[PDB]
Design a binder for this molecule. Structure first.
Ligand SMILES: N[C@@H](Cc1ccc(O)cc1)C(=O)O
Ligand SMILES: N[C@@H](Cc1ccc(O)cc1)C(=O)O
Ligand SMILES: N[C@@H](Cc1ccc(O)cc1)C(=O)O
Ligand SMILES: N[C@@H](Cc1ccc(O)cc1)C(=O)O
Ligand SMILES: N[C@@H](Cc1ccc(O)cc1)C(=O)O
Ligand SMILES: N[C@@H](Cc1ccc(O)cc1)C(=O)O
Ligand code: NA
Ligand code: NA
Ligand code: NA
Ligand code: NA
Lengths: 79, 79, 79, 76, 76, 76
């Protein structure tokens, strides 16, 4: 199921969540950011305009009017 | 010519445009984001502070006071 | 020392600094963005929510209430 | 294979080889765009591809050589 | 090696080889996650790893083959 | 070649090899910084480079070996 893989994906890859403005910042272990962010893309979050992954960090762009914090809180509750 | 390659680059790589705040979000096919964003860099958009590409997503930072939307609308009109 | 490597890292990799909103934009030579941004991560800037590197560009997310500009000015003074 | 042909025309700056690897050079940032499409084709002789920024390493399946794999890509 | 075993179970879609290279295929974006962990293990026979997006090239140390290195990874 | 020499001093943590590949290890995120500069040099014996995060695969042109290509880079 998708909710279960989202839960396990976040359980295993989300080291921390942070935010500023319209951006939620996801911290992963090394190399984990593209792995996590690709999955987030594919679960189809309406509040998520898009994501970009580097190596251990993902920037999640919140759809207006939702904030980075509120977006990050959503994802944390999926854990 | 540069306008023609910008037009064809956007025609072939820009799956969709979105925006939030000062960020225009470009969606590409798989692997296309660095290809597209590098070219955007090199055409020298004054309104563009910079770009970062992941795999299929580019975040374009709009130069103040222009918005992500207005930046995205500019690029769409180049199509 | 860390301040010295931050100084030399910035001296050799920071082509330019820019900003918009809460994002400081770092420009590097080709391939230099992950090299620079990883180091910035590891020096532990409280004002820095996180960073993402592409190839020659880094987006540094400023911790509220600090701005991208103020964040970029901090880093420039480390040069 | 009509789509791969346009993909190579627009992205393949050069093809080289050594041993069992064919190397593709692209314009900047083009490597994962080209290489992911090659994966999608799914050729039996391609063990795998790695994309950097403007270079793709394509591993040829033994006993095919990287020179042979590069010639097929250069053909298309 | 208990952590690598879970890492491979969750990320290793397939393993292939040619010459002295073992190729790991992962779900999308999984390659640098898997490959950095492999580096961390630090096996003597692994000369190095490169991660793309969903493919990892693992270079086997002579005289070990990529087939042999892939079998050890497939084992775990 | 004076710039490559400083580039290697600051970024080359180690050099290894297997078959026709020289492997460069860098500090974290250093691989595309080093590798793009190597491309820029444009050595005839370098068929191509791929950068991951901290590892660069440099493919040696036959009949040169990756050991030989790594020794030249280690020299500089
Ligand atoms: N955190 C930044 C910088 C970074 C780059 C490479 C690394 O290996 C680690 C960190 C990113 O993920 O893009
Ligand atoms: N869209 C994000 C996450 C992603 C990563 C890897 C992919 O293959 C696909 C998507 C990015 O481009 O960074
Ligand atoms: N500046 C953008 C786009 C880019 C991608 C690849 C390049 O080689 C150059 C530029 C980034 O660093 O992500
Ligand atoms: N050609 C190598 C090195 C490189 C890295 C980054 C670049 O922008 C350019 C070249 C690769 O694509 O991995
Ligand atoms: N399999 C290759 C090509 C690729 C690039 C980007 C992708 O999203 C998917 C595949 C790699 O991982 O480098
Ligand atoms: N050494 C491999 C795997 C790796 C990936 C990401 C890292 O942050 C570290 C290592 C590479 O650079 O591709
Ligand atoms: Na890392
Ligand atoms: Na990136
Ligand atoms: Na993709
Ligand atoms: Na570049």
């Amino acid at each position: 199921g998708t909710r279960e893989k989202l839960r396990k994906m976040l359980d295993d890859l989300l080291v921390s969540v942070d935010h500023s403005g319209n951006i939620a910042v996801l911290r992963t272990p090394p190399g984990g950011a593209p792995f996590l962010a690709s999955f987030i893309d594919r679960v189809g979050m309406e509040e998520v305009v898009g994501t970009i992954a580097g190596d251990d960090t993902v920037f999640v762009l919140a759809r207006d009017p939702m904030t980075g914090q509120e977006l990050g809180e959503f994802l944390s509750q999926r854990r």
